[PDB]
Amino acid sequence: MKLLPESLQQEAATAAVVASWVLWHLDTQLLPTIMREHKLHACWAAAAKRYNEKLFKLNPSY
Amino acid sequence: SSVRDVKTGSLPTNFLTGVYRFWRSQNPAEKPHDPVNDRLLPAVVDASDKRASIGTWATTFFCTIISCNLLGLMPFNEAPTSGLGFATGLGVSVWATATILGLSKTGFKFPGHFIPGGTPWPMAFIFVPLETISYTFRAVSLGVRLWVNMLAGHTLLHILTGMALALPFSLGFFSMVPATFGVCCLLSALVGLEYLVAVLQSGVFSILSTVYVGEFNHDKFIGPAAKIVK
Amino acid sequence: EEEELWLLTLTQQFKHIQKHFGIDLPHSVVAHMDPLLIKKIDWETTNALEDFDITLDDMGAEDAKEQWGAENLSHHFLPLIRYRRDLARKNGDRYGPDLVNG
Amino acid sequence: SYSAYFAKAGFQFPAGLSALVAGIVALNVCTGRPTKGTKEISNAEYNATPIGYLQSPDQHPTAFPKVPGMKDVHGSPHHHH
Amino acid sequence: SYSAYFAKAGFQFPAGLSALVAGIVALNVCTGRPTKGTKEISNAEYNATPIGYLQSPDQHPTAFPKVPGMKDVHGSPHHHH
Amino acid sequence: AMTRQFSAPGSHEHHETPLSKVMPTVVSIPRKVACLALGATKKVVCGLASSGPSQNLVSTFANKVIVEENLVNVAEIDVPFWSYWLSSAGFTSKDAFVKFAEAVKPKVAALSTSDITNLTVAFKRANYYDKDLFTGIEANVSANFTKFETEQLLQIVATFDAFNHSSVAFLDDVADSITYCNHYLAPVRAGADELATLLTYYAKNGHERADLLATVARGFSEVSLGKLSAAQRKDTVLSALKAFQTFGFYPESIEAVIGAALVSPAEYSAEELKEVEAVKVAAENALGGEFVLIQEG
Amino acid sequence: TFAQRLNSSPAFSSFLLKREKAESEVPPSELELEAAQKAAELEDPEVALRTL
């Protein structure tokens, strides 16, 4: 059967290229989008208690 | 120059989000002794800088390997990880990456971590050389385990399919069905196992990376050198 | 009617987001409506702090987690304090929240 | 509500997919060595050689061989023994 | 007056230039014969052959030869005479 | 054979390094490692060659590139671009910077935040002051303070501190941008030397902004202060403590500033240490506690 | 309703979700249904003024 390829360096360079592109794409395209959506909800959920209280102290509407 | 717009709540985004959170959870941050506040915040940021980006790295390897494995299950396609250099190159790159990381911050003390904890000090001598070989053996075994699974499964399917095809060829196409029916079920179940193996191998490889690189993902906390108590 | 504009803006913006977030809200609109929030989130990603909130959860730092989220939305109050500071300044008065003992 | 806006923009490739394919091709064309089943020969030896003799049966397998090992070309019947 | 409108649209290739280049490439890659200076060999003969022997000096001319006829590789020193 | 016989005891002694002196005796007085660290340091000290005479050669290039208006109209293209790199090479000529200010003044209103920052940093290195140019610059910043970044504003403020120039509208717009329009953790990446410059600028202007002070104080820490030169660290501490004492604001993070001085008091004089302890007791009364030094172990 | 908004989203317009309904997975509570019905009544600002 086929055991050894025609070039080991060629196969390794291919894998490294693909992995490097995925890493760049993740940091440059995926993570910024994910964090924009994820952190929006998380900040509101974490601040809702202190945010509403601070606002309640500021408006003289009551 | 003009970037595209993205719909919030997109299915690919949500899937990738949970994947990152899952791998990031594999290496949780160590809870400091002091209460986290404005005084401790800069030291926590420093700890994050000393921490490696394993979560980013592990998800990168997971997605790239699972994609290559799933390509081997598509018709008219082969898995890139079935090539010896392709699969082994990833394992060596992981092992080399962890090695370079450890040697950077701790340097000469890196051979130190190799010592097993709680060992009696006189006995220790004969232990570290064997563990050194085991550490260097990870480079091979990590990549070979992935490669063998992609190679042996495809080769096994090849041999068994040749043996299965001999039945309808010899006993007629539509003459008798029960003998070929039973072998078709076994072959169908084997392909189903290959799908599971692809998910298992991509997970195992990423898990092992989080374990090995996590071994050196530890540093002493630069806590407050002065404090106003009470 | 003195500060109604600022209060009505926050209500309108938040309601529109909740009505569409995670369903069909486009990212372009989010940055247009709240550019400062996006400027904060993208900074964390640029400064290798994309998982800062997850780090606080690992150590259970509840007080830091609440402060983090509050500071990320603190700019929502900026228009009100700028207006109230200008009101005091034209009258020569000092704004309370600006003082160390205020 | 915004469903009709997202229907305007069609399918779009990844932001940097072109660079990934470019590297993959370069790794397969700029190998710096003979290409998968060939040997470099002198320019003199290339000009006069008939193309039928310049080919090898193994490099021309049948698309659907009735017998394992069928080749589409016979190559040169002259060897170097 | 409309000068600023024409300045918006930048340089644009001909409407069907892509098809012209595609045909030109196909005529140079799908020649159906060995590629300019090479000979097809059996798959067996390709696997074990060292790449230095699998090359020919004429196919590797020097970029700036100090003497006309300088070659970058020596090839195999073994011939078939 | 003999190679292995020698290799084993060679590694044996190396295995003693990762221990809190578990064996009877391992730690040594000579501490040869000090030589290795100092050896590397000597090389970088030489690398820091100033090449001052070459600055004249660089001046020649500058004069034979942009200064001769006969080749290119200086006012037509991008003053922020060329001036940024020219000052980076050490070309600081007041006569050329005069041409630059007149060439850029009609365009300042259209410059981006990045261009404004680089242009301002260039004038800092040149130590050249143009009141009319800084007026247009401060108007641009005040009009778009939400778009500016703390990393940029810190460099800009440093120029406003080199030459005493301030505006009440500018002071508030900058404080609001850093306190609310930027990430509250940005000072950690800023560096204590830039933070002390900003503090001194507001302290000399008497502009009390407790919200700004609470934000800037987060950047001061053992990690950020340890990265500065011993001389620069001393000057940074002595200037930062004066600003805190001027406004009477004593945040908890001030203990890291004081600890940096008390851990190495040999660099400070008696009069400097006296005012340091004066702030220490003042902060101890404000925070309601007692100062104690923490020791590793 | 929240489920009604999801059913109108582009995800449900896809081939594999063309016949799916969000309510089939999680039905809305009575409080949600009555609130959505009330909101539809207050879409007219004149009616809201007379009510308030």
Place this chain on the structure above:
Amino acid sequence: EGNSVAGIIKSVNETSGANLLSSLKTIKAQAAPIYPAAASSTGYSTQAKIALFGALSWILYRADGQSKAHEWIVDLNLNVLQAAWLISFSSLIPFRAVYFAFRGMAPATASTLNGLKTFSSISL
């Protein structure tokens, strides 16, 4: 483009009390957020056509090699065995349940957006 709230305030302040109630429906529409209408129907995007051509070409290139390969019949039968599982997944997988499973992975979509409350933003 100015903010819609400022447009409402100006429009309401300038409108007469007699035509206030009748014009409220118009002002409400004038401040309604833009929802782009459906554009003209297009069969396929330019990039989509390239994707189909590239996928077909890759498939044919691989299939041609497999047919010319040794044990060529085995390769073609392996493709059938694999293709059968693709049909099985499309039939067995409860895509609606799976959609909610992935939606439940991310905290931003596993729960509703809990934030600003009404009583805190009342403008009286």
Place this chain on the structure above:
Amino acid sequence: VLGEVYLKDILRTPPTGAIPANVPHPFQTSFYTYATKKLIPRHWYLLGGFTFTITLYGILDGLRDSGKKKAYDEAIHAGKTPYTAGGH
């Protein structure tokens, strides 16, 4: 009264005219910025691991080629055919 000028570029209502273009992230604007701020400062370990592997595999390929050369030259001096036979 509070006039829109206090929130000009701070808070904005949802658009009513047309959907604006998406704001590009700094890494999406230029590759140089991402490389200098995150790729090299945080992930340079990965680049080294890939480079070390590629260089190692090139050495292994050279060692493999040297083994073929030795066996090839030995068959030539034995006066034998270095190749067994083809399938045709």
Place this chain on the structure above:
Amino acid sequence: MAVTSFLGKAFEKYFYDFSAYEQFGLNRFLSSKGQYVALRHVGFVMVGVNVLLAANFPFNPPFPTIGMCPAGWEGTWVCQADKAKALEMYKEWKKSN
């Protein structure tokens, strides 16, 4: 063009609306619908196997048959073990037929 949009609408109805399990009423015989699809796949496999083999039945098998013959041949070039000899025998048979 329209021809492509029409096929999309048609395939949708086939995927969701058209079910042979219901039109033939196989619920009378099969236990669960989830098991019916499993049998349909094994049938598809057996169908594909016979179809691929029927596409060109007169061929020498590359796989090693375990002492069995297809039809009343048993000694033809189709049944030869060594392929090098089988190629010569097939060429003679092919030029005749």
Place this chain on the structure above:
Amino acid sequence: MAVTSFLGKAFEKYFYDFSAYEQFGLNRFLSSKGQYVALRHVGFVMVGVNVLLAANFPFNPPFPTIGMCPAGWEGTWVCQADKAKALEMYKEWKKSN
């Protein structure tokens, strides 16, 4: 980036505004400006010829020299007629130097 836009403005002034014929006042010596540019081109050719030759002067010429020698060599590998022999002689000279 700006660096490219700057070069465009600079090249424009060079093409139209900067003329060496006027700055040096060659109208005193040359008949017509249309003839001056002709001499400038022949000079450019001669310059390019010498520059390309100076880029690597120690080389055997591929073109047939008509019984002439470059310098005080006349018998070096640079002066050998047949290139097959010249290559051997050059290799010996190169390993020494």
